[PDB]
């Protein structure tokens, strides 16, 4: 069983990656280019249930980065919630360009490795209007030193830095979100890459209104997958993580101070916001929390690795019976 | 950057060509062979390589073609000698000692014979119906160059089991499954110099009209007891045939057919002209001036459409990488 959901059909990886650069707007009036169909695709990963423990787990152990999937559900940041779907961190090449292998990885199971989204980016920062970008971000670095917002921008580049890319951080993250008119929730142990993107470029009517999900850890991102068939539980991830017998918020990047005194109502515009019943540190409480809906799996024929991974791993499990 | 080897290129579409090849034997209740009702016209062509540049051909190369037994099999003169004809290329092939059954799958399907469905089907064949006539034919054969006890050892070693991770086959094992395929088989085979291998030469479906077998040969290379598929490569003027003879000095040698009965034989030259689709070429003489003609047998054109099509898809993935500089 291949080691990567693309190398299943590693043609149509391809077809999908060539599919890529072609969705891509470029409006040259200001305005940021972005997809303009490509961001509302999600891949939701196959149950290994209703499967042997002893090919279960051979599934996981090619498609899983367990390592980080420990990590994060030990610190009690990744499925946390016992009332939520459980999230998959799937496997993602260490190259520093991480950022885009797993965002892409979410939406179209193949990494960047045309560096499609990479490049969008940095074209973007090196053309575009950055204005707002830039004052976004030196009001964030100054809630805690000005050749800062130029190196910033040579990070997105696709030069050789030791790793093979630059390594991106939480700038790269809110521009890329704008790109894709699309949220993006970071799950990590400092939730300080850690929290929620918004695509506040855009009005929310123009925006996908499902988050994009990745983990977090060492320099690291992976997409954080749901996993297909598992109900009775809420397909949402929770907007707050438990932390010293309270709730507290995931942090909100990059807002300027009117958005922040309207920060509930935002999340609500961008993300389909419900409030859910989780257990209380009291065993006799109950508390009401915010979550995001996250999407239903809807690659389609065409542009779906996953089901040829499956259909790979169906074969396999005849013969392996 | 490409894949290592053919079959990474579409894993989903292998899948889909080997589910297809068992649901495609008919088994007949008359006690006549189990065989292949349309996936045995299938034929696979390689690409060319000539677009690209050295360093990119030598990943393509090191990827799909068995090199080593290329140029063995071409120092000796025995493949791509004739300068009429289009250019065979090896494949490379698992050696699991079912490479007999990877090759030939390799030739038609561009899959190996990972899911055991013809090294099964041949076992079954062996196992489980009568083979008097293969047997005859068999000992007539050994005793050109205890019978019940041979016999026996020979349907064993087409069995699954373990002894490689399996029983390497021989030459009544290839005109076997040139029956279940009901298309001559050709092997073209190392073997020491004549001034100084008996698995090479032609094994026809003699357990079926002609008419009712596909005349176009699947063509195979051996050596070290290692088969592989040796293909057409995509081109004319030059010709698709493979020579029915090699040279031997100033000489030619037909290659051997095996397995005929002794009217057969005599009639050998008629025989091969109704199973294949023989043509003479003409060569340059080693011994007098000129030119002599030596029979060949023509190659299928590539038929083996984009959609069970691995090589289509490799080539695909070749243009996209290559494109990248
Ligand atoms: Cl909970
Ligand atoms: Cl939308
Ligand atoms: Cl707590
Ligand atoms: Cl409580
Ligand atoms: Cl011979």
């Keep these: ?15 999908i990656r060539e599919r890529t650069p072609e969705d891509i707007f470029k409006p040259t ?14 891949l939701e990963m196959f149950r290994t249930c209703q499967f ?5 787990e051979i599934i996981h152990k090619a498609l899983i980065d367990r390592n980080i999937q420990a990590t994060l559900e030990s610190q009690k940041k990744l499925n946390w919630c016992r009332e939520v779907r459980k999230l998959v961190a799937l496997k993602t090449n260490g190259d520093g360009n991480c950022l885009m292998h797993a965002t892409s990885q979410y939406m179209w199971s193949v990494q960047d490795t045309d560096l499609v989204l990479r490049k969008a980016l940095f074209s973007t920062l090196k053309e575009t209007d950055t204005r707002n970008f830039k004052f976004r971000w030196q009001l964030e670095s100054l809630k805690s030193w000005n050749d800062e917002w130029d190196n910033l921008i040579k990070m997105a580049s696709t030069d050789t830095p030791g790793l093979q890319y630059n390594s991106l951080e939480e700038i790269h993250i809110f521009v890329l979100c704008n790109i894709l008119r699309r949220p993006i929730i970071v799950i990590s142990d400092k939730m300080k890459v850690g929290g929620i993107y918004l695509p506040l470029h855009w009005p929310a009517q123009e925006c996908y ?11 690291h991102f992976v997409p954080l997958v749901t996993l297909k068939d598992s109900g009775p539980e809420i397909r949402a991830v929770p907007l707050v ?10 942090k909100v990047h990059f807002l300027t101070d009117p958005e922040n005194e309207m920060k509930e109502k935002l999340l609500k515009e961008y993300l389909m916001v419900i409030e859910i019943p989780v257990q209380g540190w009291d065993h006799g409480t109950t508390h ?26 169906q074969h396999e499990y005849k013969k392996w019976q």
Aim: a positive charge; glycine letters at 4%; aromatic letters at 12%.
């Design 29 to 42: 009036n200001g305005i940021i280019h972005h997809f303009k169909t490509m961001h509302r695709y999600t």
């Design 241 to 250: 993580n438990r932390d010293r017998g309270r709730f507290e918020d995931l």
């Design 52 to 56: 042997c423990p002893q090919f279960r």
């Design 209 to 219: 209104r499902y988050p994009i999900v990745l983990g977090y850890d060492s320099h």
């Design 288 to 313: 009401l929390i915010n979550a995001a809906k996250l999407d239903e799996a809807n690659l389609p024929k065409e542009i779906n690795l996953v089901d040829d991974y499956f259909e790979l791993v």
């Design 1 to 15: 069983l291949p080691q990567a959901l693309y190398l299943s059909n590693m043609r149509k990886a391809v077809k």
